[PDB]
Design a protein around this ligand. Structure first.
Ligand SMILES: [Zn+2]
Ligand SMILES: [Zn+2]
Lengths: 74, 74
């Protein structure tokens, strides 16, 4: 199905390559091989640019868990 | 106010000191200064132990953002 992310906070663009967005906006991630800045496309504003990946979460639950942090506790 | 986290996924205990929980449980964090495993207390099961911090989210929205990922886009 169409897989999107939702913004957890507002972000104000400050460069010519980042993307502003509002809390609750739905974003399509067009690229995530760049590190912790992801190339996103807004479903509601039609703008495109880089976003901080820690400002968004997946739009749907039922995702599978991430790897556990290592080391494990005792 | 009472600050809690919510489980995003089930977690099955596998060590001597970790804590099992179910998706949707609310957890009170009693120590989060030791690394990415946090000492938690279940509101519903009354159990206590270490949880993987990437399996939980804050219960409340409207917390403040994390600092912007390190390097930048220009
Ligand atoms: Zn799909
Ligand atoms: Zn409070």
């Amino acid at each position: 199905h169409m897989t999107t992310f939702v913004a957890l906070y507002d972000y104000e663009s400050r460069t010519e390559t980042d993307l502003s967005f509002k809390k609750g906006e739905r974003l399509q991630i067009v690229n995530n091989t760049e590190g912790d800045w992801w190339l996103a496309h807004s479903l509601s504003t039609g703008q495109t640019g880089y976003i901080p990946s820690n400002y968004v979460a997946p739009s749907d639950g039922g995702g599978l868990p991430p790897p556990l942090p290592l080391p494990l506790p005792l």
